[PDB]
């Protein structure tokens, strides 16, 4: 299973959908492929960006979020 999605995004389990979006934008920008494409951090960032997008894709969906919380 995944490392916890909330912790990855730096949010608490009871945060709002807008909190999730703000955290996603901040962290996705940190690891954005357009920043890392010519650096040795390309691989690190690819993995982190992927996991950030996965965390947001689950937690931003009301039903998938409640299922994750079970």
Residue numbers in the entry: 1 to 70
Which statements did the authors publish about this structure?
In the Laverania subgenus of malaria parasites, of which P. falciparum is the only human-infective member, a single Hsp70 chaperone, Hsp70-x, is exported to the host cell. Common to all Laverania parasites is an expanded set of exported proteins for host cell remodeling; thus, it is believed that Hsp70-x ensures the correct folding of these proteins, thereby supporting parasite survival and virulence functions. In addition to PfEMP1 and PfHsp70-x, J-dots contain multiple Hsp40 (also known as DnaJ) cochaperone proteins, which can stimulate Hsp70 activity. At least one of these cochaperones, PFA0660w (pf3d7_0113700), was shown to preferentially stimulate PfHsp70-x activity compared with a human Hsp70 (19).
